[PDB]
Design a protein around this ligand. Sequence first.
Ligand code: HEM
Ligand SMILES: CCCCCCCCO[C@@H]1O[C@H](CO)[C@@H](O)[C@H](O)[C@H]1O
Ligand code: FES
Lengths: 196, 59, 442, 66, 78, 100, 241, 379, 406
Amino acid sequence: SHTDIKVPNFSDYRRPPDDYSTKSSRESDPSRKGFSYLVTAVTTLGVAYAAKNVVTQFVSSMSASADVLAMSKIEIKLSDIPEGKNMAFKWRGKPLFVRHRTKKEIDQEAAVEVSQLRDPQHDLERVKKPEWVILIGVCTHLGCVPIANAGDFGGYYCPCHGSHYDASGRIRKGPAPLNLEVPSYEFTSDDMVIVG
Amino acid sequence: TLTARLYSLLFRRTSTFALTIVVGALLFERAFDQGADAIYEHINEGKLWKHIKHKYENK
Amino acid sequence: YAQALQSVPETQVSQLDNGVRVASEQSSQPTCTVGVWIDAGSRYESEKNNGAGYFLEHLAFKGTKNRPQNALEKEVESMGAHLNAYSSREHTAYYIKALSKDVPKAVELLADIVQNCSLEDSQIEKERDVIVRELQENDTSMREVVFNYLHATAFQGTGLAQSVEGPSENIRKLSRADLTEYLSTHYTAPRMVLAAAGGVEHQQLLELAQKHFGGVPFTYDDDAVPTLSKCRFTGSQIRHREDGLPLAHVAIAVEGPGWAHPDLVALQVANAIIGHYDRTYGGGLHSSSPLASIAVTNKLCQSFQTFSICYSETGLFGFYFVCDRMSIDDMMFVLQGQWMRLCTSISESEVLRGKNFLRNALVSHLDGTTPVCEDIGRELLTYGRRIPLEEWEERLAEVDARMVREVCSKYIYDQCPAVAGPGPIEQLPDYNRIRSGMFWLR
Amino acid sequence: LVDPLTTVREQCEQLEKCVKARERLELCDERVSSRSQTEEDCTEELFDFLHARDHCVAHKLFNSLK
Amino acid sequence: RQFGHLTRVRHLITYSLSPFEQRPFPHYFSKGVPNVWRRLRACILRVAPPFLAFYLLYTWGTQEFEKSKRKNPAAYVN
Amino acid sequence: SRWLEGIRKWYYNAAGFNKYGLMRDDTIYENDDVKEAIRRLPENLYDDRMFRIKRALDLNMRQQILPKEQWTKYEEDVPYLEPYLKEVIRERKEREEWDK
Amino acid sequence: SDLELHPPSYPWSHRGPLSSLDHTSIRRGFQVYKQVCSSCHSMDYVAYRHLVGVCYTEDEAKALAEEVEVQDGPNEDGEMFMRPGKLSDYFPKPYPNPEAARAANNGALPPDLSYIVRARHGGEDYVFSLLTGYCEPPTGVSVREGLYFNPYFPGQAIGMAPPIYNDVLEFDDGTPATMSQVAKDVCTFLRWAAEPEHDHRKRMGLKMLLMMGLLVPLVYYMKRHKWSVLKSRKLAYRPPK
Amino acid sequence: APNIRKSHPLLKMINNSLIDLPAPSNISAWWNFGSLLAVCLMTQILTGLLLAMHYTADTSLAFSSVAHTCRNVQYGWLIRNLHANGASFFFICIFLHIGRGLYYGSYLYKETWNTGVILLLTLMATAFVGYVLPWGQMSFWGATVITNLFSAIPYIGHTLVEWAWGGFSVDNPTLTRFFALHFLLPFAIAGITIIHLTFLHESGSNNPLGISSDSDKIPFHPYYSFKDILGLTLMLTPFLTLALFSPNLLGDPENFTPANPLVTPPHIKPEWYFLFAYAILRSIPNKLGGVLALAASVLILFLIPFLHKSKQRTMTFRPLSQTLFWLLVANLLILTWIGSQPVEHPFIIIGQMASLSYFTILLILFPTIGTLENKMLNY
Amino acid sequence: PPHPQDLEITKLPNGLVIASLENYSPGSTIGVFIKAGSRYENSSNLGTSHLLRLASSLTTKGASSFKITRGIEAVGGKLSVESTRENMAYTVECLRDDVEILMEFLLNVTTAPEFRPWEVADLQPQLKIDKAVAFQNPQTHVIENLHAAAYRNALADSLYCPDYRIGKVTSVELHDFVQNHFTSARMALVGLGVSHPVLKNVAEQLLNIRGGLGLSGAKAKYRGGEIREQNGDSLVHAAIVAESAAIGGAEANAFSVLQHVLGANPHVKRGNPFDVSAFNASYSDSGLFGFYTISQAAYAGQVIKAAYNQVKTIAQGNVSNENVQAAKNKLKAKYLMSVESSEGFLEEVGSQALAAGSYNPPSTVLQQIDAVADADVIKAAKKFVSRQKSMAASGNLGHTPFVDEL
Ligand code: HEM
Ligand SMILES: CCCCCCCCO[C@@H]1O[C@H](CO)[C@@H](O)[C@H](O)[C@H]1O
Ligand code: FES
């Protein structure tokens, strides 16, 4: 018939010693689940660890390149740069500006309405000798090389998206966000100058 | 009762479960790392630069 | 309304120095029903004793010593009364419906059966071959075999996994003695209940019972009622496959709390929510019961029903569906999903309906003499006293959504379920699948 | 200053095996340089010697080096 | 080939238990390790042979080569 | 000198498919002819063969086998499919022959 | 004759899967390389930069780089010109090109000891045996002019004369500069030279083992757990009558 | 459909290939190689692609570029190591996979099997190129022979060559195009790997008993997803132990010497996973014959399916062919050893012997022992 | 205070009988009894009855299919339709205040059906199954046919739509069927657990039709039909009848009594594994009387003969005035008992309030059953043996006799 079928004995055969009738399965196993999920929890855990690192590694596997240089110092004969002109030098992976400013330029650069600047800084706090201005030839917007002796502010201009810079290297008009970078530098004599 | 308290709180709700995996991973890390390093460095005393760093930085 | 509830007559009870509790609810109704509801069942049978209570049921009527077959039936037939009965796993009952103008006559008759069955060794040997047949019918009621199996595995190893009818071996070999053994052992006053409903007057009933149930207890034992062995639930499965059958049945459940436990109310409201469906209804727009709705839209089942079958100290909260060989899965999936929804994100809107629907069955549960009697009998036997629809009203009128979740999750969430499935069940996925179906990827 | 190598090689050139080889060699050497026209070489013999020698030179030499 | 359309199967009953109700561990020692052996011993005599054999051919062959490398004491006794 | 009979019982126990509790015919790979044969198989024998195979799968999947007692014996192995199979083949060869 | 002598095995302080490199011993090796080998052997893939933090100090290595003048970029008139070696330069080639070296070495070509240890079977064991291992050719065997016998080298006649003998230099750490000793220190250098990772790589292997160890078992329990439902399972054939 | 795991043109694919996919209940480890294989294809593509970010296809820079990648790119050494050794765990796995298949008649599933043979071939080809990439002695001389290997084809030969690689001798042109093939082929592998599984899924996976498994069959997921993630970690520990403890264990040191177009080193040994073939090539003293023999050594796989005579699929109940099987596996193992040896009498012969036992154990013994066992059953 | 509150009846000017009865039960159940049915069908439109029976939940002019089902359910209601060859009862049940709510839907369902061409063309396939399940009980098959052989016209029509017409019932045929029968004069707004003033104050909206009897079925012509369904079910079903007894029809109570007089007789008059009873259907202008016998196949002929002889000799004076005494008592029970369950009781107060307009108290209803005895019965049985007989059968029948063989 069917009244004749019976579920076999899974006794010691399998069942964990908290499951052998006359006493609730409940209350017992709902502790057993704990263990069986603990293994699991932990595995996800260990795996997590493993994963976190394989990614970390395989992520720095490009970020930079353990091939980084340094050259912080460069000597420049200030007489190479006569009044009115800006010379561009090869330096540390990006251009470097060194300019001889005229009476007029230095004057206009101080005459700048500082409270109205995108990046507020007075010409005199950005340079040491007012007839000498030094800048990093990289536009702050998206990285193009600003063109010296171009633009509406007698400083520079970036042909990529139209940022206008002054003789102080400050951003005035256009999209650039902050003023041109001023490197670390000092004059070792009358016609000598060192950047970095 | 660890297991039971662990299940009842941590493992039961799929929510909680994960959340502890994260917090658990954190602890497992800090802990596993320090240790492995220890074990490691120990098994190599005085051979590491960390260990010699001193003949130009004492020990 | 609430008044309609309060204005309903109280249920009278009164125990004998015997053990027999006599309860009854009165009404105008000429007719009525009366009976004895024993605390006997297959759960009380042994390995060799399994079947008794049933084989017995089949002779309880075929006459007593006092009045042989011809006489009992004749005396009953002749008075236009109906004497019918049944035997479950933990509850046996014998009842008659007469014109109350016979409370006394019926009572005596009842008494004469729970006490003096002929048990004619000849009448037996005949009922033997009858049950053995009747049992062969029971077999092709897939709707049934599916539940026995459920118990068969959900309570594997304990008394509850034994079916009421009993193995075909026991039926073929029970002895005139065994039936008596069963009788004399379990049909004792402290466990039986004389209940009745109709135009009967309690007192007359007392005195009548008090008069034909002249039982007498000497020892302390006589006066005490034995508590059964506890039944171990076991999240497991039993698959009796046959792709020969028209379609497949599936039933899955969790261990339930047991009569006593107050949550069975909250829990009752839950099952009220997903409800039950059948292809004859009239509502692909059905009430919430998405299972139903989804059942309808996606033609998932021929039928499905929810249930909280409960016992003294355990029980089975689950569901059952019938379906084409082909939609078994989506059905389980879609349904098991509803269990989660139920204890994970049930709304007030639902319980609101849930409750009322219940209160509607709560009521029609007592629709007539017999049914009412059926509750008093059960009530006392399992709850202790009677539970007034005014009580049930309160109990379940205080269930809020939050409470349903609380409970359903308490009894459903991440529990290892019991599955049963006969038929062309190849499409039903392994246990693990339907197991991880118990926790929602909340 | 004395190279623990030569020191340990001394000891090692006396372990049973070596002597066995050294001899086997000494014979080959004085056996070839003894004739005016022969193709034989004493590389083999020499190797067996060396091999056995340095083998222990190696199982101890690094103990005395810093 | 999906589920529900694989074969005509009839009259097979199976009984299984929640992984939480039994023990994955299982019965090592009782039935566990015994079967393991029941298998080493069952094929050790079908597998090893060819491998063992090669081993020899290996050893033989190399040795032979290594031997064929040394001088024949008598290649020039004169 | 040396009975093929003697040999067959050798191979039969050597093969060892009887340890899983299945007959010879339970193992024949199911190519076109076998499929058509098994398809003619009376429902008795079919359902048996099914169970037989499923039992085996379950054993194999457990790594265990049948207790020594239950292994079928060489002389008791029943070629329940061989006959049907042959007819199938000659039925076919006949067609093939004709289509020339 | 294809008859050769294979080098024995020395118990290098760094041999073991978990054992690092004797950094101090490498410092010396650097020295023996820098003061004696680096005049015939280029080591193109290494640079002062590496020494920093492994066996040397930044300022120490900086200064150590200064000692070399290197030919650098075009002027403003465009003309190679010399200048102090930066920390970034690689170790100095002793020759402009191979033929230049071959000329300066009786015709032979001294290899670049960058990947030498792993360009030769036996690595240090070999290189070590080679350096500390010259001698008189046994009888019948005559090594030609310009060569020198060394049984360890394939062919027995190398083009390199014994480059290392007692006192050839003075380990400033106050270590007995015996040939054997100084030969060891070179090799241990040569190894790190071939694979700076070495230490990192092993510490890594360690952690790896522990995880496999902790994870495979855990996922093993899990696999079992799930499968039980089947292993445990029980079939049964119950046809009608 | 409510499912969503069955109603999504894309999502269904996953839930139709890794979940719900019916798989025989009885499946041994010997079925793990495959998912591993796929993983190798991933590992490789990932690391390799990562490694190609720093390679520089060009004679004057190739070699050094690799070195720079290890010595300078953070973990570049780890990356290369994993890439280098993955090649191996890849062949190991593929080899085991082919084995399994051969000894369960998995080959009866023809298309799945034939595409397979294409994968082996491609894998082999993609692995030849690439090794040519770091441009060390081995890289170069490998390139010169394997390419020159096509010279044997008459007429269209010497031509195909002086086209195969750059112009008229392994040189820059032939390097830059190799980097290209190597970058391109792994994808073609993944491609064919899709087709492969496709023909597979048409017919269920096989199973060790060699008898229908429709009687059982579990949902891929709960089960095999786990079984595989396990096989993953097991065959992951060895390979990571190599890449971390003995990296050049399986890799010839000779290849640490930049290429010299004027000196092929004495003792040129092809990378292990190619030895057996190699062995066969040299031991049939003819440019052509040798080549044909080579051809056949691998190309033979296509005929395996037509050499099946057993009335049974797998050969679990074929004690006879069963040992014949291991004779072969070892026969192979020997050809490998023999392949790592110089050409002297102690060997050579052993060579052409094994290199023959191979072909017969396949074209002749097997089918024979085959029908034989049948008759020992009355078939 | 006692719950006695006489069931008031108030026939509105239309003819819409309204019978209530507050019984204070918590759950009340209202219901619209109608003199509709499958008896008013023609060669065509057949089954429209059945399809109408299922269109219960289709949209109305006051509420949509949706709202109606979810509205009734929102309260824990029940809306269902019970129907006979000559009467349709649309009941609905709930409780407390919700009765008021539950009504709107009931109202609309019976008076504002706007049977939408899609909703129906889209529902008809349901007949197929509704019928498929019904026919799972061989009893229904036999009886369906019985009536087919017992009659030749209305009432002999099927209760379950014939197959060939499953997809052909038009949206039209439905309205036309409602309009011609669902009229005030042949309807009744019966109900329980309700105050009568309340239940009346609703029949005011329910006023939206008048046409007394819209189509009045044709009288029922009798015939001694005989149809056999060879199908092999291991066990035969048989039913034998002879026209007789109309509802209200005096001669009726006789058979009800003969119905019980018979039984202990036919059953106890046939020995072996079987089942046999006294059949009795009382219709408006006719009825049927006899006996169905589920019997094992081969023992088919035996059982029907035996059970027939019993109805025979029970006519030839084989009835003790005692038999009649007992049987008169069983009816008293089966009547009274089968009135406990509020649905089977709302059936009494309704069935009457429609057929008559009155309400015979359980007193005289007995005084009427009591009223007759020995007097008839024996005679009632005679009428069976003499009148023409129409038999119906389902099963192997290879061993089942025909009427021409008695
Ligand atoms: C190129 C990489 C390859 C990958 C990623 C791969 C993967 C797979 C996968 C995922 C399976 C699943 C079952 C199993 O693992 O056994 C499979 C099966 C199979 N493959 Fe491949 N395979 C590749 C190459 C090959 C090769 C070279 C052969 C040819 C000998 C081959 C022959 C087969 C066969 C016979 C099966 C089906 C039989 C069975 O599953 O029992 N595969 N392949
Ligand atoms: C699958 C198992 C994976 C194991 C996790 C790999 C651990 C790699 O961990 C590595 O350890 C180094 C030594 O401390 C650190 O310098 C690295 O930054 C760190 O990523
Ligand atoms: S790039 Fe300088 S303006 Fe944008």
